[PDB]
mmCIF file of all heavy atoms in Angstrom:
data_model
loop_
_atom_site.group_PDB
_atom_site.id
_atom_site.type_symbol
_atom_site.label_atom_id
_atom_site.label_comp_id
_atom_site.label_asym_id
_atom_site.label_seq_id
_atom_site.Cartn_x
_atom_site.Cartn_y
_atom_site.Cartn_z
ATOM 1 N N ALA A 13 2.981 5.704 -0.404
ATOM 2 C CA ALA A 13 3.580 6.928 -0.052
ATOM 3 C C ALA A 13 3.893 7.833 -1.389
ATOM 4 O O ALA A 13 3.679 8.982 -1.486
ATOM 5 C CB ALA A 13 4.779 6.753 0.845
ATOM 6 N N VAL A 14 4.529 7.081 -2.285
ATOM 7 C CA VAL A 14 4.905 7.670 -3.660
ATOM 8 C C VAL A 14 3.610 8.410 -4.276
ATOM 9 O O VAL A 14 3.692 9.506 -4.515
ATOM 10 C CB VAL A 14 5.371 6.725 -4.693
ATOM 11 C CG1 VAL A 14 5.304 7.164 -5.985
ATOM 12 C CG2 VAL A 14 6.872 6.319 -4.254
ATOM 13 N N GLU A 15 2.532 7.603 -4.350
ATOM 14 C CA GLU A 15 1.201 8.186 -4.832
ATOM 15 C C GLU A 15 0.793 9.363 -4.056
ATOM 16 O O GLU A 15 0.246 10.371 -4.673
ATOM 17 C CB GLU A 15 0.084 7.109 -4.849
ATOM 18 C CG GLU A 15 -1.016 7.508 -5.877
ATOM 19 C CD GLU A 15 -2.207 6.699 -5.535
ATOM 20 O OE1 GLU A 15 -2.518 6.434 -4.399
ATOM 21 O OE2 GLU A 15 -2.900 6.337 -6.530
ATOM 22 N N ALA A 16 0.948 9.362 -2.727
ATOM 23 C CA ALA A 16 0.414 10.368 -1.911
ATOM 24 C C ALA A 16 1.303 11.735 -2.006
ATOM 25 O O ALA A 16 0.736 12.840 -1.962
ATOM 26 C CB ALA A 16 0.192 9.976 -0.466
ATOM 27 N N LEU A 17 2.610 11.399 -2.293
ATOM 28 C CA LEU A 17 3.419 12.676 -2.394
ATOM 29 C C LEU A 17 3.320 13.430 -3.551
ATOM 30 O O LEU A 17 3.453 14.583 -3.715
ATOM 31 C CB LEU A 17 4.888 12.183 -2.169
ATOM 32 C CG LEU A 17 5.319 11.799 -0.841
ATOM 33 C CD1 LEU A 17 6.404 10.683 -0.927
ATOM 34 C CD2 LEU A 17 5.763 12.931 0.036
ATOM 35 N N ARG A 18 2.832 12.713 -4.670
ATOM 36 C CA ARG A 18 2.426 13.547 -5.966
ATOM 37 C C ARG A 18 1.221 14.399 -5.788
ATOM 38 O O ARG A 18 1.253 15.504 -6.015
ATOM 39 C CB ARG A 18 2.245 12.498 -7.051
ATOM 40 C CG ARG A 18 3.247 11.532 -7.240
ATOM 41 C CD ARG A 18 4.443 12.077 -8.132
ATOM 42 N NE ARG A 18 5.407 11.028 -8.359
ATOM 43 C CZ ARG A 18 5.496 10.289 -9.361
ATOM 44 N NH1 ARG A 18 4.641 10.381 -10.319
ATOM 45 N NH2 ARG A 18 6.433 9.364 -9.309
ATOM 46 N N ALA A 19 0.093 13.696 -5.221
ATOM 47 C CA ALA A 19 -1.027 14.581 -4.987
ATOM 48 C C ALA A 19 -0.907 15.555 -3.865
ATOM 49 O O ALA A 19 -1.745 16.318 -3.711
ATOM 50 C CB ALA A 19 -2.151 13.445 -4.666
ATOM 51 N N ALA A 20 0.138 15.446 -3.150
ATOM 52 C CA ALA A 20 0.326 16.279 -1.930
ATOM 53 C C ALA A 20 0.264 17.688 -2.275
ATOM 54 O O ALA A 20 0.969 18.141 -3.164
ATOM 55 C CB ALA A 20 1.618 15.936 -1.304
ATOM 56 N N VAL A 21 -0.676 18.389 -1.535
ATOM 57 C CA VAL A 21 -0.921 19.882 -1.703
ATOM 58 C C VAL A 21 -0.772 20.499 -0.295
ATOM 59 O O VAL A 21 -1.308 19.869 0.603
ATOM 60 C CB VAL A 21 -2.222 20.215 -2.377
ATOM 61 C CG1 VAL A 21 -2.381 19.708 -3.805
ATOM 62 C CG2 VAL A 21 -3.375 19.788 -1.496
ATOM 63 N N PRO A 22 0.063 21.594 -0.162
ATOM 64 C CA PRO A 22 0.061 22.138 1.182
ATOM 65 C C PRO A 22 -1.396 22.615 1.576
ATOM 66 O O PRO A 22 -2.054 23.073 0.783
ATOM 67 C CB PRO A 22 1.026 23.381 1.007
ATOM 68 C CG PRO A 22 1.018 23.617 -0.501
ATOM 69 C CD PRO A 22 0.909 22.166 -1.131
ATOM 70 N N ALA A 23 -1.719 22.249 2.922
ATOM 71 C CA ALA A 23 -2.926 22.474 3.278
ATOM 72 C C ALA A 23 -3.267 23.445 4.563
ATOM 73 O O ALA A 23 -4.378 23.717 4.846
ATOM 74 C CB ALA A 23 -3.700 21.202 3.656
ATOM 75 N N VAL A 24 -2.104 23.712 5.271
ATOM 76 C CA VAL A 24 -2.196 24.659 6.358
ATOM 77 C C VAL A 24 -1.188 25.852 6.041
ATOM 78 O O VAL A 24 -0.381 25.647 5.257
ATOM 79 C CB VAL A 24 -1.951 24.004 7.625
ATOM 80 C CG1 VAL A 24 -2.938 22.953 8.100
ATOM 81 C CG2 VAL A 24 -0.521 23.252 7.672
ATOM 82 N N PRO A 25 -1.459 26.929 6.729
ATOM 83 C CA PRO A 25 -0.424 28.008 6.570
ATOM 84 C C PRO A 25 0.833 27.716 7.163
ATOM 85 O O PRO A 25 0.916 26.677 7.911
ATOM 86 C CB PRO A 25 -1.095 29.178 7.514
ATOM 87 C CG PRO A 25 -2.521 28.758 7.630
ATOM 88 C CD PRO A 25 -2.546 27.257 7.654
ATOM 89 N N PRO A 26 1.918 28.325 6.910
ATOM 90 C CA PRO A 26 3.233 28.196 7.445
ATOM 91 C C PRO A 26 3.124 28.246 9.022
ATOM 92 O O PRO A 26 2.277 29.081 9.449
ATOM 93 C CB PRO A 26 4.275 29.283 6.831
ATOM 94 C CG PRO A 26 3.233 30.187 6.241
ATOM 95 C CD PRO A 26 1.972 29.488 5.799
ATOM 96 N N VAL A 27 3.866 27.607 9.753
ATOM 97 C CA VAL A 27 3.727 27.396 11.130
ATOM 98 C C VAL A 27 3.982 28.793 11.795
ATOM 99 O O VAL A 27 4.905 29.597 11.262
ATOM 100 C CB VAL A 27 4.590 26.400 11.803
ATOM 101 C CG1 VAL A 27 4.556 25.125 11.006
ATOM 102 C CG2 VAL A 27 6.080 26.857 11.964
ATOM 103 N N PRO A 28 3.346 29.257 12.838
ATOM 104 C CA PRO A 28 3.710 30.540 13.530
ATOM 105 C C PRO A 28 5.034 30.549 14.049
ATOM 106 O O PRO A 28 5.716 29.434 14.456
ATOM 107 C CB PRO A 28 2.603 30.590 14.569
ATOM 108 C CG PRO A 28 1.498 29.586 14.361
ATOM 109 C CD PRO A 28 2.346 28.497 13.641
ATOM 110 N N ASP A 29 5.579 31.672 14.449
ATOM 111 C CA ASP A 29 6.762 31.902 15.136
ATOM 112 C C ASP A 29 6.711 31.396 16.609
ATOM 113 O O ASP A 29 7.722 30.902 17.123
ATOM 114 C CB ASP A 29 7.250 33.422 15.079
ATOM 115 C CG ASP A 29 7.056 33.899 13.650
ATOM 116 O OD1 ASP A 29 7.588 33.330 12.738
ATOM 117 O OD2 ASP A 29 6.531 34.997 13.584
ATOM 118 N N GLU A 30 5.528 31.334 17.107
ATOM 119 C CA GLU A 30 5.300 30.795 18.456
ATOM 120 C C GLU A 30 4.490 29.611 18.232
ATOM 121 O O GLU A 30 3.553 29.608 17.475
ATOM 122 C CB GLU A 30 4.741 31.731 19.329
ATOM 123 C CG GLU A 30 5.627 32.877 19.847
ATOM 124 C CD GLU A 30 6.204 32.419 21.317
ATOM 125 O OE1 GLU A 30 5.401 32.382 22.244
ATOM 126 O OE2 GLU A 30 7.373 32.192 21.236
ATOM 127 N N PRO A 31 4.749 28.484 18.954
ATOM 128 C CA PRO A 31 3.886 27.397 18.710
ATOM 129 C C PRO A 31 2.413 27.532 18.895
ATOM 130 O O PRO A 31 2.012 28.291 19.914
ATOM 131 C CB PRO A 31 4.351 26.189 19.692
ATOM 132 C CG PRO A 31 5.083 26.910 20.721
ATOM 133 C CD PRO A 31 5.770 28.013 19.981
ATOM 134 N N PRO A 32 1.566 27.066 18.113
ATOM 135 C CA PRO A 32 0.083 27.219 18.217
ATOM 136 C C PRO A 32 -0.497 26.651 19.391
ATOM 137 O O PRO A 32 -0.007 25.586 19.974
ATOM 138 C CB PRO A 32 -0.538 26.628 17.008
ATOM 139 C CG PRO A 32 0.586 25.548 16.578
ATOM 140 C CD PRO A 32 1.891 26.126 16.912
ATOM 141 N N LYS A 33 -1.500 27.294 19.918
ATOM 142 C CA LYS A 33 -2.375 26.732 20.948
ATOM 143 C C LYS A 33 -3.257 25.587 20.281
ATOM 144 O O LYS A 33 -3.639 25.665 19.063
ATOM 145 C CB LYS A 33 -3.157 27.743 21.715
ATOM 146 C CG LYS A 33 -2.360 28.842 22.460
ATOM 147 C CD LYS A 33 -1.635 28.300 23.614
ATOM 148 C CE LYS A 33 -0.760 29.428 24.171
ATOM 149 N NZ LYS A 33 0.533 28.837 24.690
ATOM 150 N N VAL A 34 -3.777 24.621 21.091
ATOM 151 C CA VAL A 34 -4.667 23.544 20.638
ATOM 152 C C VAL A 34 -5.939 23.490 21.503
ATOM 153 O O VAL A 34 -5.840 23.606 22.676
ATOM 154 C CB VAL A 34 -3.878 22.294 20.623
ATOM 155 C CG1 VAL A 34 -4.836 21.133 20.394
ATOM 156 C CG2 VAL A 34 -2.630 22.257 19.893
ATOM 157 N N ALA A 35 -7.006 23.390 20.844
ATOM 158 C CA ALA A 35 -8.291 23.397 21.483
ATOM 159 C C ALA A 35 -9.034 22.004 21.100
ATOM 160 O O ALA A 35 -9.051 21.714 19.862
ATOM 161 C CB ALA A 35 -9.275 24.579 21.210
ATOM 162 N N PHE A 36 -9.610 21.230 22.018
ATOM 163 C CA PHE A 36 -10.406 20.133 21.711
ATOM 164 C C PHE A 36 -11.909 20.541 21.681
ATOM 165 O O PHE A 36 -12.413 21.177 22.658
ATOM 166 C CB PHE A 36 -10.314 19.041 22.739
ATOM 167 C CG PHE A 36 -8.973 18.266 22.573
ATOM 168 C CD1 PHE A 36 -8.719 17.283 23.487
ATOM 169 C CD2 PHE A 36 -8.128 18.595 21.578
ATOM 170 C CE1 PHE A 36 -7.454 16.552 23.379
ATOM 171 C CE2 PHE A 36 -6.967 17.835 21.474
ATOM 172 C CZ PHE A 36 -6.638 16.844 22.418
ATOM 173 N N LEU A 37 -12.631 20.151 20.599
ATOM 174 C CA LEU A 37 -14.071 20.436 20.512
ATOM 175 C C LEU A 37 -14.783 19.091 20.625
ATOM 176 O O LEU A 37 -14.535 18.151 19.852
ATOM 177 C CB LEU A 37 -14.317 21.114 19.126
ATOM 178 C CG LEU A 37 -14.176 22.659 18.930
ATOM 179 C CD1 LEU A 37 -12.822 23.062 19.335
ATOM 180 C CD2 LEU A 37 -14.376 22.954 17.525
ATOM 181 N N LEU A 38 -15.673 18.971 21.577
ATOM 182 C CA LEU A 38 -16.349 17.665 21.920
ATOM 183 C C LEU A 38 -17.848 17.669 21.572
ATOM 184 O O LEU A 38 -18.644 18.543 22.222
ATOM 185 C CB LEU A 38 -16.316 17.456 23.425
ATOM 186 C CG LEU A 38 -14.843 17.208 24.218
ATOM 187 C CD1 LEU A 38 -14.094 16.097 23.504
ATOM 188 C CD2 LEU A 38 -14.030 18.455 24.423
ATOM 189 N N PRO A 39 -18.345 16.947 20.600
ATOM 190 C CA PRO A 39 -19.662 17.010 20.167
ATOM 191 C C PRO A 39 -20.669 16.497 21.198
ATOM 192 O O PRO A 39 -20.371 15.689 22.048
ATOM 193 C CB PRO A 39 -19.716 16.226 18.865
ATOM 194 C CG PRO A 39 -18.247 15.587 18.616
ATOM 195 C CD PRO A 39 -17.381 16.341 19.640
ATOM 196 N N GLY A 40 -21.875 16.838 20.905
ATOM 197 C CA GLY A 40 -22.941 16.412 21.943
ATOM 198 C C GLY A 40 -23.515 15.478 20.783
ATOM 199 O O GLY A 40 -22.824 15.532 19.665
ATOM 200 N N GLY A 41 -24.483 14.748 21.017
ATOM 201 C CA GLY A 41 -24.826 13.763 19.879
ATOM 202 C C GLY A 41 -25.369 14.051 18.568
ATOM 203 O O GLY A 41 -25.688 15.210 18.314
ATOM 204 N N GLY A 42 -25.458 12.946 17.792
ATOM 205 C CA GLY A 42 -25.983 13.087 16.453
ATOM 206 C C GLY A 42 -25.158 12.526 15.514
ATOM 207 O O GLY A 42 -25.646 12.261 14.377
ATOM 208 N N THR A 43 -23.932 12.209 15.768
ATOM 209 C CA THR A 43 -23.015 11.641 14.809
ATOM 210 C C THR A 43 -22.567 10.121 15.385
ATOM 211 O O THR A 43 -21.705 9.521 14.688
ATOM 212 C CB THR A 43 -21.793 12.488 14.585
ATOM 213 O OG1 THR A 43 -21.093 12.686 15.859
ATOM 214 C CG2 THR A 43 -22.189 13.840 13.956
ATOM 215 N N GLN A 44 -23.108 9.699 16.528
ATOM 216 C CA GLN A 44 -22.673 8.404 16.978
ATOM 217 C C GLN A 44 -23.063 7.379 16.040
ATOM 218 O O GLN A 44 -24.144 7.504 15.314
ATOM 219 C CB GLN A 44 -23.235 8.196 18.325
ATOM 220 C CG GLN A 44 -24.801 8.026 18.442
ATOM 221 C CD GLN A 44 -25.518 9.276 18.450
ATOM 222 O OE1 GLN A 44 -24.947 10.424 18.373
ATOM 223 N NE2 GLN A 44 -26.826 9.256 18.535
ATOM 224 N N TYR A 45 -22.448 6.222 15.979
ATOM 225 C CA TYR A 45 -22.888 5.078 15.159
ATOM 226 C C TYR A 45 -22.191 3.744 15.733
ATOM 227 O O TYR A 45 -21.091 3.949 16.434
ATOM 228 C CB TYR A 45 -22.476 5.106 13.646
ATOM 229 C CG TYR A 45 -21.088 5.557 13.436
ATOM 230 C CD1 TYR A 45 -20.290 4.565 13.081
ATOM 231 C CD2 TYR A 45 -20.712 6.827 13.405
ATOM 232 C CE1 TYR A 45 -18.885 4.898 12.770
ATOM 233 C CE2 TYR A 45 -19.301 7.127 13.053
ATOM 234 C CZ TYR A 45 -18.522 6.126 12.743
ATOM 235 O OH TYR A 45 -17.147 6.491 12.565
ATOM 236 N N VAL A 46 -22.837 2.611 15.525
ATOM 237 C CA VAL A 46 -22.259 1.338 15.772
ATOM 238 C C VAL A 46 -20.978 1.110 14.959
ATOM 239 O O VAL A 46 -21.061 1.385 13.751
ATOM 240 C CB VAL A 46 -23.155 0.282 15.566
ATOM 241 C CG1 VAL A 46 -22.726 -1.090 15.964
ATOM 242 C CG2 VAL A 46 -24.537 0.551 16.317
ATOM 243 N N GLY A 47 -19.857 0.833 15.550
ATOM 244 C CA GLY A 47 -18.533 0.573 14.994
ATOM 245 C C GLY A 47 -17.605 1.773 14.974
ATOM 246 O O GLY A 47 -16.447 1.650 14.590
ATOM 247 N N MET A 48 -18.087 2.854 15.572
ATOM 248 C CA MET A 48 -17.125 4.025 15.689
ATOM 249 C C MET A 48 -15.867 3.764 16.606
ATOM 250 O O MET A 48 -16.085 3.114 17.603
ATOM 251 C CB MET A 48 -17.904 5.312 16.103
ATOM 252 C CG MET A 48 -18.410 5.153 17.549
ATOM 253 S SD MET A 48 -19.475 6.633 18.055
ATOM 254 C CE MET A 48 -20.171 6.066 19.505
ATOM 255 N N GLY A 49 -14.679 4.146 16.115
ATOM 256 C CA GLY A 49 -13.494 3.872 16.810
ATOM 257 C C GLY A 49 -13.086 2.413 16.905
ATOM 258 O O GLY A 49 -12.076 2.112 17.546
ATOM 259 N N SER A 50 -13.864 1.428 16.223
ATOM 260 C CA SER A 50 -13.534 0.013 16.284
ATOM 261 C C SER A 50 -12.068 -0.237 15.653
ATOM 262 O O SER A 50 -11.324 -1.070 16.197
ATOM 263 C CB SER A 50 -14.441 -0.878 15.434
ATOM 264 O OG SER A 50 -14.370 -0.570 14.105
ATOM 265 N N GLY A 51 -11.558 0.631 14.746
ATOM 266 C CA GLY A 51 -10.284 0.467 14.197
ATOM 267 C C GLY A 51 -9.236 0.917 15.311
ATOM 268 O O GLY A 51 -8.192 0.264 15.397
#
């Protein structure tokens, strides 16, 4: 955690006044592999 907090750089804009909407994007294939999600 200590190491990550030093390298920490803000990466998204400040949050909107109204909570953001969320969309899920679902790929068709090409990126599948053995072991995906095993963790």
Side-chain angles (χ1 to χ4, degrees):
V14 163
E15 197 197 40
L17 288 151
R18 310 276 179 97
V21 298
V24 293
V27 316
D29 309 313
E30 280 267 293
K33 303 288 176 219
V34 175
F36 284 178
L37 280 47
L38 291 310
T43 60
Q44 69 278 1
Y45 54 94
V46 184
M48 61 186 171
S50 69

